[PDB]
Amino acid sequence: VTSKMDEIQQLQKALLDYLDENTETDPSLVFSRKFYIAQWFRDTTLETEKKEIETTGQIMHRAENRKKFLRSDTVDYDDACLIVRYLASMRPFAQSFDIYLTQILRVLGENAIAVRTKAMKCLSEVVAVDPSILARLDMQRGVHGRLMDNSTSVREAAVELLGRFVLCRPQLAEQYYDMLIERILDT
Amino acid sequence: AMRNKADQQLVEIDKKYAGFIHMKAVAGMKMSYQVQQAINSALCSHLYSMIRGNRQHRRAFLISLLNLFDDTAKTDVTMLLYIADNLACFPYQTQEEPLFIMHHIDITLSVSGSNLLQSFKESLIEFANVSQGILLLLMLKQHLKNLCGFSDSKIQKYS
């Protein structure tokens, strides 16, 4: 939330020149260079796996990789930061968070108290980092269920979540106020 | 607000002295029924939840009321409806209750019903009334069995 708001091969070339200069500046950078090389190699093969059109494309790709490894201007630091951020944002990691969330909701129905308590508490932390996530209907029904759950621990965790979320975003809190202030008499 | 104040007062009466409420329970529901027939879910649930702590008391009041009313007593049909609705509405938090109730109802049902059917085939508004009684109790058993959806084998396995 604080970051986002054939050319790819040319970018790979540019990053290689950046690191190449930094080899002169400081040792151990050669290891990083070889590591990036291997990672590009395996990523092209793994996308290849999913054909003859991309077969010819990847054989020029991979041959260029072999050549360019054998081959061991003016681009600098911030540029390198933004390029590698972009190329990482292409990788199958930045679009993983969503998946992770789903996993968490599998936990909420379980047969052990402590795990559910801690899950709810960490979720409270999660939402209090990014306040615009109480939109997906499944999480809504989750926090409702846990508000009606049959154990005092998860009950206090849930009410703490809902209260901190209400406190953070000043307006738009009159929609949770009723379900909140119902809960005072909870034994 | 009325019964809110009432029930809160009752829990205060109970929390000190263990036995008291358990002493007068069937007369309770009888007077309640008289009150309702003077006035005109789960109304009786609060007392039922309160008296669930003691295992013997729990078996006791239930067995006494259920058996006395149904088998040989000409209890009011409205009273039977009231008690039946209250029994069905009752929240259950264990497994002893449905098995116990089902077991005893079955036994009495068996003997009484068998006698009834053989005497009617061998042979009557009196028959109409007592038959209405027994059939309502039957339907209670069936509705209960549907509420749990358990096989009669598993129930009869319980002793």
Partner: peptide, 18 residues
């Protein structure tokens, strides 16, 4: 997902006094 909620409020609903 509605998995395990306590039956109604009777678990925790001590009624309001007057």
């Amino acid at each position: 997902i509605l998995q395990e909620n306590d039956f109604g409020d009777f678990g925790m609903d001590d009624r309001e006094i007057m």
